[PDB]
Design a binder for these strands. Structure first.
Ligand code: MG
Ligand code: MG
Ligand code: MG
Ligand code: MG
Ligand code: MG
Ligand code: MG
Ligand code: MG
Ligand code: MG
Ligand code: MG
Ligand code: MG
Ligand code: MG
Ligand code: MG
Ligand code: MG
Ligand code: MG
Ligand code: MG
Ligand code: MG
Ligand code: MG
Ligand code: MG
Ligand code: MG
Ligand code: MG
Ligand code: MG
Ligand code: MG
Ligand code: MG
Ligand code: MG
Ligand code: MG
Lengths: 190, 176, 134, 107, 204
RNA sequence: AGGUUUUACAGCGCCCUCCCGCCCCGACUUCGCCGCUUGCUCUCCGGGGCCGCGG
RNA sequence: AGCAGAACUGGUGCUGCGGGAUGAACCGAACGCCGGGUUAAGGCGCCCGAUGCCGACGCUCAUCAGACCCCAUAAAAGGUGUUGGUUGAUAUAGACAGCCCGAAUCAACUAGCCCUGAAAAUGGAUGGCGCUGGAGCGUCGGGCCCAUACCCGGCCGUCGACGGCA
RNA sequence: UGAUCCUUCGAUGUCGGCUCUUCCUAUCAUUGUGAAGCAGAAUUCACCAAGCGUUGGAUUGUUCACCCACUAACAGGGAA
RNA sequence: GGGAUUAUGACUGAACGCCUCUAAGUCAGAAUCCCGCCUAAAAGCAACGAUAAGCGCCGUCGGAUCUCCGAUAGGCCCCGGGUAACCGGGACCCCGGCGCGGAGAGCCAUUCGUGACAGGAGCGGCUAGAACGAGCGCCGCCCCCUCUUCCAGUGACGCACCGCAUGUUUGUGGGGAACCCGGUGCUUAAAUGACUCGUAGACGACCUGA
């Protein structure tokens, strides 16, 4: 069955200016500028409204799989707006039983060195992505905050650290060491 | 049955051969959809032979003529009760279509059953065809066309006439 | 993005088929692929023409769905679709293409001596403006 | 120039049987079966150049030779036409130029 | 086009491999000379991992006793398309070998053809023959990952070819802008010669 | 579900009718919505290919 | 068992031809030498004659896709891949999901295409290229392509005549 | 290992070993992983995977066996 | 030594208000795969040296003669590209065009010559071009006077070869050498046999030296 129409509106706040040239949405606000390119969905994105226009997407004659991308694209633009208005904060903590994990941040947050993981002499040097800044958070023992505008870059950088501190040839149910994501919050709470 | 082209509706009536024991036997009317009257007569002796005890040699066909549509210029919502024999067993099925004439609606049923259920022409048996109002339609594929002030564009017009100019300097546009 | 929709009353141009080149009015939409068009002022009886043969124009009329051609004819003349159509460019490209296809051999001769002289006048003015611009 | 362009595509064949008595042509601007009705009957020509000089009607003996023919009927739905020449065309002419004259005219 | 032209320079960007080669192989048999440029822009249907596996499975067909005689697995996109056309020709004969000589394939647009108009076969394009929701694989990326070593140099020379043609098109636009202005300044002197063009439907 | 509740600032059905109330178009090969055919269908009625051998 | 032995009929042996890439037997059709016309079975992206139709509708994405008599392999059992269908149960006396919100939701079963099940040795086989708005599967329309087959005519020969001539 | 007897009896040299090359994966080891009645060590089940390695000897004509040591492991086969 | 990735573990995120590595879109990833490194070098090729009255070019003008071999029968019409969009114009906007005439269904050429009377509009400089490079572009002097292109005229003549085919183009075509003809070029050219060498060999070949 081809549904004749399936739409979804995305209301934007007054502090951002969402623009688009075809399917290339560009969100600009107080913290930065984001720009995604949706030339793979084959949809239309109309920007309607008198003041601070809302974003309305459409999908004409779409099957069950093509209609699933309607809310996906709307959910990506909301993350673009949320990432510029408030920003993203993916803070993760260090878990260890005997050997404390020593983490030092270099290159102004764009690189993180992980040492003393399970007593290993190897030094793990994980490099963040463009726009993601890392820092050892205060007011806590060994938590590690990651900030940025793009959710797909802050969350991917938080995965590069967690995937780097993996235990090999051991029972992962016994050796729970590593750096795991604690919570996925925001920079400016609102 | 071959189901060639458009299946036309034939009103085939028949009766047993009159004898001295049963003079003027009962007449049986049938609603047959067949490409021509030669097949429509054979379809009559297929359902009547399995409903009543009467073959082609024991009875006769009294009338076999076309049944034209009373309103060929009005969109109608049809409902077809059928039963097709799959590879495993026989299944009853009720499908809704939408066409101007009942001759073309049943034709869509043979194209749909063959496309979705791989059912040939000899396995499908049409039982009831009824012009259903727009309130008793159960299928959402027809109920979406039951919206007044309907509006939808024609996105991504695929280029036909790909061989009138077979070679050209212009790439085809698909937005109109 | 889209500016031409398949709505009740949308005047559509038949691209190919039996009534090739004549306008119709979409009265009702049967399926995803078919429509119930009816051109009362053009010469096309009411029938089910597919969307493959239709080309949407920029003219909409005020008619309910599945209305008689008596009322379609009224809204066809109230919106003067035939007057708006004949004065459009897409209708004048068709008229100009029919003239060129019906040109005789004497016409192709008179049309050749014209563009051979008309282009020499324009190409001389183009070089005159080009030298002055340099 | 008073002749349209054609191409000797091959002989009237099946899949593994050739009939050299009938040749298939490829007209220049004819890509439909309904556009061959003009060329039916026009005289064809396979103009080639051999080594020795041959006589020429209406001129000095040049090095040019010709094989005459005519268009007989349509072939398929793609504007191909059949042609029967006086002598069967040599197989080396497959893909070369065939002249389609404008006579016998019917316009 | 469609005019029995002397040399048909078909562009390769956007076209499908077998769709374009099925038409090119038919034109070379009729005696025409086809020049397919930008063979690295041809794309094949199906996702990339399928079309790469179809070629990796082709690399294994070497002759066992002596691979020097086995199937020559060409890595250049022009030579990949050239072999696709060869499979659709009777290359074992003389008319099939002569038809391959009429076809010339290039990776990019060389100087002999960068100043020519490139044609487009609509019966072989990606937008016309493939649904927008289907996957496709570019022959340039497919060739680079199987042993093509000249993808960066072709992309560098193609960028210089585009920036050199963009400078001319800016001069072609400013020349056409003067041509349109020339007709407005001389319209009173060509009114007699433009009406016969209007009368016979040449000018709308 | 047009207009402000079923015709109203559009229309869509179904009945009794005023003689089928009354006229005009007849499957449109006769003005490209849909079938079957001569009750010997009519045409110095057009066009193309093929060959007229014998006596 | 491409095994052994029977029955009816056909074929083959003794038989070429068009189609099934290939072939003893399958499908069509049986044969003097030729011109024209038209078909059968089978076909019409290119090899390769013919859809270079603005063919109709729908199904289908496969990191071993699929591609049709004989025929050149695939099963049980599974899928919240997707599309139909059957039978029931909840829900503005406000369900389902979520930690109040306010419109549909849930379960069983069944059938299509696809997928898992699916491992063999020289490099390789829808016939090849390749094809994914298709060149795939199912149901159908128009047109077109050619056999030594059908039709008309020429020629040879054989056969027959209730045959023609002193 | 049979069953069959289509090819070969105006001949296709026939058991094993030696030698040498190549392929298959139904993976013994090594590389990357998933699972446990995975605490570690050891081991077991499974996945992508045949790139690479898979031994020296006593007895037997033997393929097949059995033992002695070595080893990351001493995996199973095809190519008349 | 790298590259795309398998198994696998994940990100964002719907379908299915939640959830979800997957549907669209992304990340890490290996004795495997491809390539580099390495070995060979094609009926594949480039740069460059020298080229023997004799041996080319010049002056594509050959002025004319002969022989061959293919085609062909106006065009070497150039943005990049998108497709749920695009193009053009003007100081992210605005205007205009959009079944696409700022149109490869078109456009640019082109419609028999020779002699008078009116309308209409071949060398010097600079710059740029190397993926398989030139009649390449732009200005300033000379050249005579343009059948310049179109519309109208008047009087002539260019066999009008008596109905008939291979006509017409790119053709001042591409290759071998031939013949009087007006100017140059530099002509201290190389390979090979034998001998020698032994960094090399069955014989050839190969490395050398005179
Ligand atoms: Mg362990
Ligand atoms: Mg049947
Ligand atoms: Mg057999
Ligand atoms: Mg038997
Ligand atoms: Mg036997
Ligand atoms: Mg017999
Ligand atoms: Mg077969
Ligand atoms: Mg015949
Ligand atoms: Mg075939
Ligand atoms: Mg299971
Ligand atoms: Mg579910
Ligand atoms: Mg419940
Ligand atoms: Mg399978
Ligand atoms: Mg006869
Ligand atoms: Mg035997
Ligand atoms: Mg395995
Ligand atoms: Mg198990
Ligand atoms: Mg890598
Ligand atoms: Mg994954
Ligand atoms: Mg990656
Ligand atoms: Mg362009
Ligand atoms: Mg606008
Ligand atoms: Mg004068
Ligand atoms: Mg030059
Ligand atoms: Mg002048």
């Amino acid at each position: 069955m081809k549904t004749i129409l399936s739409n979804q509106t995305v209301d934007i706040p007054d502090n951002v200016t969402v623009s688009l040239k075809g399917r290339t949405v560009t969100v600009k606000g107080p913290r930065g500028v984001l720009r995604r390119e949706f030339n793979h969905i084959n949809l239309e994105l109309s920007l309607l409204g008198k003041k601070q226009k809302k974003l309305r997407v459409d999908k004409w004659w779409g099957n069950r799989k093509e209609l699933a991308t309607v809310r996906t694209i709307c959910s990506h633009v909301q993350n673009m707006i949320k990432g510029v208005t408030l920003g993203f904060r993916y803070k993760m903590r260090s878990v260890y039983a005997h050997f404390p994990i020593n983490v030092v941040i270099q290159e102004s947050g764009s690189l993180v060195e992980i040492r003393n993981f399970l007593g290993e002499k190897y030094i793990r040097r994980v490099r963040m992505r463009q726009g993601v800044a890392c820092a050892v958070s205060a007011a806590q023992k060994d938590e590690l905050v990651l900030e940025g505008n793009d959710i797909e870059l802050v969350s991917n950088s938080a995965a590069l650290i967690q995937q780097a501190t993996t235990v090999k040839n051991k029972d992962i149910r016994k050796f729970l060491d590593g750096i795991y994501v604690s919570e996925k919050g925001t920079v400016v709470e609102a | 049955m071959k189901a060639s082209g458009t299946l036309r509706e034939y009103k085939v009536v028949g009766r047993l051969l009159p004898s001295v024991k049963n003079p003027a036997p009962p007449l049986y009317r049938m609603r047959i959809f067949a490409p021509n009257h030669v097949v429509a007569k054979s379809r009559f002796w297929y359902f009547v032979s399995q409903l009543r005890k009467m073959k082609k040699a024991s009875g006769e066909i009294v009338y076999c003529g076309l049944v034209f549509e009373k309103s060929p210029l009005k969109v109608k919502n049809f409902g077809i009760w059928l039963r097709y024999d799959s590879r495993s067993g026989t299944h009853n099925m009720y499908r809704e279509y939408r066409d101007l004439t009942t001759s073309g609606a049943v034709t869509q049923c043979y194209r749909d059953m063959g496309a979705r259920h791989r059912a040939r022409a000899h396995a499908i048996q049409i039982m009831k065809v009824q012009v259903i109002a727009a309130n008793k339609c159960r299928r959402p594929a027809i109920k979406q066309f039951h919206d007044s002030k309907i509006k939808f564009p024609l996105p991504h017009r695929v280029l036909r006439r790909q061989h009138k100019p077979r070679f050209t300097t212009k790439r085809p546009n698909t937005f109109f | 993005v889209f500016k031409r929709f398949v709505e009740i009353g949308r005047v559509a141009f038949i691209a190919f088929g039996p009534h090739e080149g004549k306008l119709v009015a979409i009265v009702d939409v049967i399926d995803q692929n078919r429509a119930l068009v009816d051109g009362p002022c053009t010469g096309v009886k009411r029938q089910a023409l597919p969307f493959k043969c239709l080309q949407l124009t920029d003219y909409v009329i005020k008619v309910p769905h599945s209305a008689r051609q008596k009322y379609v004819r009224r809204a066809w003349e109230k919106a003067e679709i035939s007057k708006k159509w004949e004065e459009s460019s897409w209708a004048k490209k068709i008229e100009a293409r029919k003239k060129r296809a019906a040109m005789s051999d004497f016409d192709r001769y008179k049309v050749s001596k014209a563009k051979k002289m008309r282009n020499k006048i324009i190409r001389h003015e183009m070089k005159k403006l080009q030298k002055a611009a340099a | 120039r008073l002749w349209s362009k054609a191409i000797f595509a091959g002989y009237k064949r099946g899949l593994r049987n050739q009939r050299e008595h009938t040749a298939l042509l490829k007209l220049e601007g004819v890509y439909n079966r309904g556009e061959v009705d003009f060329y039916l009957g026009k005289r064809c020509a396979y103009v080639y150049k051999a080594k020795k000089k041959t006589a020429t009607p209406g001129g000095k003996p040049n090095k040019t030779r010709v094989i005459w023919g005519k268009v007989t009927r349509a072939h398929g739905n793609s504007g191909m036409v059949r042609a029967k020449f006086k002598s069967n065309l040599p197989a080396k002419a497959i893909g070369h130029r065939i002249r389609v004259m404008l006579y016998p005219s019917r316009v | 086009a469609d005019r029995f032209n002397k040399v048909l320079i078909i562009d390769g960007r956007g076209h499908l491999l077998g769709r374009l080669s099925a038409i090119v192989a038919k034109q070379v048999l009729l005696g025409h000379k086809i020049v397919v440029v930008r063979c690295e822009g041809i794309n094949i249907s199906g996702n990339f991992y399928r079309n790469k596996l179809k070629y990796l499975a082709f690399l294994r067909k070497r002759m066992n006793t002596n691979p020097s005689r086995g199937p020559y697995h060409f890595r250049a996109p022009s030579r990949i398309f050239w072999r696709t056309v060869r499979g659709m020709l009777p290359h074992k004969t003389k008319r099939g070998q002569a038809a391959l000589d009429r076809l010339k394939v290039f990776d990019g647009i060389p100087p002999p053809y960068d100043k020519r108009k490139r044609m487009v076969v609509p019966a072989a394009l990606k937008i016309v023959r493939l649904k927008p929701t289907r996957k496709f694989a570019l022959l340039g990326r497919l060739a680079h990952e199987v042993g093509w070593k000249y993808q960066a140099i072709t992309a560098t020379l193609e960028e210089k070819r585009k920036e050199k043609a963009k400078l001319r098109y800016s001069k072609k636009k400013v020349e056409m802008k003067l041509t349109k202005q020339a007709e407005k300044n001389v319209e009173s002197k060509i009114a007699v010669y433009t009406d016969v063009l209007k009368k016979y439907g040449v000018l709308v």
